[PDB]
Swiss-Prot record:
Phenotype when changing Y448A: 150-fold decrease in catalytic efficiency
Catalytic reaction list: Successive hydrolysis of beta-D-glucose units from the non-reducing ends of (1->3)-beta-D-glucans, releasing alpha-glucose
Protein name per the record: Exo-beta-1,3-glucanase
UniProt keyword annotation of Secreted present: yes
Catalytic site: A445
EC number, UniProt record: 3.2.1.58
Temperature profile: Optimum temperature is 50 degrees Celsius. Maintains 70% or more of the maximal activity from 35 to 65 degrees Celsius.
Record-linked InterPro entries: Pectin_lyas_fold
Length: 548
């Protein structure tokens, strides 16, 4: 396999002299604006410099990024904008897009990023305020900010929940159900339940997402070193720690590539750069070399055929998977992503493997099925922003038609999840069977389409927890976690709890909530048999500050 080469027709590379930048970005936006389940994919990459008179409106399956070592190397006097015009001010389907490694000087002092899930905002410098809500305070369900500096105020307004880590903000305007912060300079003080702020002084460990940049006229991928007890940006003090990898040390994957060729690339020592596109594979992509980077551009998507697993990472240190959508095929896959092998007991503490901006979809763009979407066997793994989503709308949706029993199953020890979004599974959305796990920010919604109580009976429990810790576990900690229901097929259903866990002094939760949307079903409790049921049709959360 030959490394390096051209990035393909779906990576649009701009510099300040490029003619009609605005028209070009507008053309992509008109194509992608309401293209929720289409198969086009775009990455908009900007060379270092200053860009004037630009409002880069970002639609579905569009990633926009600067190519400097530092965000302030690529500055827009202008905006990188997500709004909800196509959906009449409702921002709850603004998925699958991204912005990173840019400085913004927004036209009216405020940049609007009105997104919901799988819309990461990383390594950004906003010289002004950041508005997270659609124009009109419509519904919105984000969101994820990391390694960013916002000079002014962040305004969530109608956003339901949000996670921010290892950043700096000039202000924070409000909370709704669950705003969580770890390592954020300027974060509001811990105050849950009112306002619902969950605030941690540092992030236990984090490692910023690799990204493409230009060193002179050479393309390279920067690979940040991990930080322990992280706080504030990784780049504020100029010189960031990490390794730079030449693009010729990457297999540049373009659609047409087979899993055989991709796997041969890794075997031969090359990293992986998935250009924007959709990759249908008939055997798993196997990453069994330590320190391999597998970086997607433009919401690059992998679809496994034949019921195979899409991506398997071996029991090795340092693998960095980033920026990939895994879309289930119609033939049921036993697993979609596996990190490490069943029973693996080696540690990876100095140099862990990470999944970042890894999104999973089951159904929605046609029937799709998978039993367990992500299994995490390797100890010390970091899951830093994932959305694992069984579809509730689109093509191929049905209690049986896109059945997906389990979202994420964590079996490894010392696994950390930061920004964990998992929704709509027929059984447990998240199970945690490994020791000393930690989750900072959880967002769940329970399956809308359970047909009746008997269909979700779980032994002597009504329904399956959104987040279950196995009874054998002795240490676990979670912060800022919410489960919502909207049993619209059968609103007489009861869900016993959002959370289930053994009662042990080492198993601790902070700032839990469950919520029924419009009285469509109700929760009996928050965790186990503890916490008030939801009641009424007024969408008021039931909360638990500390457990046990």
């Amino acid at each position: 396999v030959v490394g390096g080469g051209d990035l393909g027709p779906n990576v649009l590379v701009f510099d300040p002299s490029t003619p009609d930048i605005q028209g070009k970005v507008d053309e992509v936006f008109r194509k992608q604006e309401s293209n929720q389940f289409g198969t086009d994919r775009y990455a908009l990459m900007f060379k270092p410099g200053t860009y004037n008179d630009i409002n880069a409106q970002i639609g579905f399956y569009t990633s926009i990024a600067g190519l400097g070592l530092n965000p302030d190397d690529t500055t827009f006097n202008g905006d990188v904008t997500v709004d909800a015009g196509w959906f009449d001010g409702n921002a709850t389907q603004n998925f699958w897009r991204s912005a990173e490694n840019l400085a913004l000087n927004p036209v009216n002092g405020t940049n609007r990023w009105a997104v919901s899930q799988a819309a990461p905002f990383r390594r950004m410098h906003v010289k002004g305020g950041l508005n997270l809500a659609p124009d009109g305070y419509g519904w919105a369900s984000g969101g994820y900010i990391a390694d960013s500096k916002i000079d002014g105020e962040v305004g969530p307004y109608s956003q339901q929940q949000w996670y921010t880590r290892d950043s700096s903000v000039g202000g924070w305007g409000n909370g709704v159900w669950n705003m969580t912060f770890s390592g954020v300079e300027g974060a509001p003080a811990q105050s849950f339940p009112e306002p619902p702020y969950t605030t941690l002084e540092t992030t236990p460990v984090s490692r910023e997402k690799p990204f493409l940049y230009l060193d002179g006229d050479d393309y390279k991928v920067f690979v940040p070193a991990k930080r322990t007890n992280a706080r504030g940006t990784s780049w504020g003090n100029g010189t960031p720690e990490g390794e730079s990898l030449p693009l010729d040390q990457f297999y540049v994957v373009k659609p047409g590539a087979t899993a055989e060729t991709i796997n041969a690339a890794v075997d031969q020592g090359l990293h992986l750069l998935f250009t924007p596109g959709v990759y249908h594979v008939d055997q798993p992509i196997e990453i069994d070399r330590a320190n391999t980077v597998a970086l997607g551009l433009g919401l690059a998507t992998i679809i496994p055929d034949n019921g195979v697993t899409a991506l398997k990472v071996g029991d090795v240190d340092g693998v960095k998977v980033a920026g990939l959508l895994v879309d289930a095929g119609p033939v049921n896959s036993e697993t979609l992503v596996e990190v490490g092998s069943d029973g693996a007991s080696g540690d990876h503490a100095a140099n862990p493997t990470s999944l970042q901006d890894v999104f999973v979809r089951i159904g929605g763009a046609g029937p799709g099925k998978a039993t367990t979407s992500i299994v995490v066997n390797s100890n010390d793994t970091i899951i830093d922003h994932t959305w694992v989503w069984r579809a509730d709308h689109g093509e191929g949706v049905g209690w049986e038609t896109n059945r997906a029993d389990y979202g994420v199953h964590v079996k490894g020890d010392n696994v950390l999840a930061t920004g964990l979004f998992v929704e709509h599974f027929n059984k447990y959305d998240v199970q945690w069977s490994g020791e000393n796990g930690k989750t900072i920010f959880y967002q769940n919604a329970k399956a809308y389409d359970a047909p009746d109580q008997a269909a979700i009976q779980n032994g002597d429990i009504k329904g399956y927890a959104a987040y279950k810790v196995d009874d054998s576990v002795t240490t676990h900690e979670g912060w800022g976690m919410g489960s919502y229901c909207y049993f619209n097929v059968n609103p007489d259903i009861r869900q016993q709890h959002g959370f289930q866990a053994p009662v042990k002094p080492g198993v601790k939760f902070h700032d839990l909530l469950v919520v029924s949307l419009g009285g469509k079903g109700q929760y009996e409790h928050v965790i186990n048999d503890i916490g008030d049921p939801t009641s009424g049709d007024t969408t008021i959360p039931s909360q638990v500050v500390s457990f046990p």
